[PDB]
Amino acid sequence: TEDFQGLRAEVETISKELELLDRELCQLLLEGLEGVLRDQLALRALEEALEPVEPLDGPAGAVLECLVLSSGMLVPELAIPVVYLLGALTMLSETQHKLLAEALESQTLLGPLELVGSLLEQSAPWQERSTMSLPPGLLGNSWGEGAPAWVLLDECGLELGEDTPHVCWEPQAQGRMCALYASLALLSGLSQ
């Protein structure tokens, strides 16, 4: 029960809600996010930081300094966009986690978003099995087993094959794909 225009629009509006962060808050945030993706100490310390905050060290602390005023108070229109993000991460594998981190410290956020975006917009709709043919330029340097675009989708539960074919959409990939989409998306937006 979703069309991807809802998803994209839903994720788009949240993407704008973090446009508040100016420069350092913008590049210090995704810096400290990049920690919790390769480190669970921060992922689970940040997830439990929210639920009147106090100071925190390390990577999860780097994300709290953007959300808080001079008391412990989190700004709701800021704090919620990130809670929406960490949930999208709860869905992903830890392998997908390390990859996001690895795509982050490179320009390579936008490429896969365009790839996930097509495959999501191609699967018509998210329930029925779909044929889902692969976009030409977005599959990476050498596409195949180890390829960082392969294990992204593969760890969403997609059955893939070698000579640039389509890939059968199994609706069980929806939340992992919608989450890989949405997380890819928010991150690239802050890169901007």
Helix (H, G, I), strand (E, B), or coil: what is residue 169? strand
Omega before 55 within 30 of 0, i.e. cis: no
Task: Looking at the chain, list the stretches that DSSP marks H as alpha helix, in order from N- to C-terminal side.
Answer: 5-17, 24-38, 40-47, 58-67, 76-91, 94-104, 110-122, 148-154, 174-191
The whole-angstrom separation of Cα 4 and Cα 23 is 30
Across the chain, the runs of DSSP E, i.e. the strands, are none
Query: Tokens 């929406």 sit at which residue?
Result: 84
Residues paired with 68 in a beta bridge: 74
Q: Counting Cβ atoms within 10 Å, is residue 91 exposed (0-12), middle (13-18) or buried (19+)?
A: middle
Enumerate the domain spans of the chain: 1-192
Residue 127 phi/psi, 5-degree rounding, is -95, -60
DSSP assignment string, 152-183: HHHTTT-B--SSS-B-BB-GGGHHHHHHHHHH
Residue 50 region by backbone torsions, left for phi larger than 0, else alpha for psi between -120 and 50, else beta: beta
Q: Cα-atom radius of gyration of the chain, to the nearest Å? A: 17
The whole-angstrom separation of Cα 166 and Cα 160 is 8
Experiment used for this model? X-ray
Task: Work out the widest C-alpha separation in the chain, in whole angstroms.
Answer: 57
The whole-angstrom separation of Cα 151 and Cα 130 is 20
How far out from the chain centre does Cα 25 lie? 19
Query: Tokens 């973090």 sit at which residue?
Result: 18
Q: What six digits make up the tokens of 20?
A: 């508040």
Q: Counting Cβ atoms within 10 Å, is residue 66 exposed (0-12), middle (13-18) or buried (19+)?
A: buried
Half-sphere exposure of 54 (CA within 13 A, CB side): 0
Give residues with Cβ within 8 angstroms of 163, minimum separation 6.
none
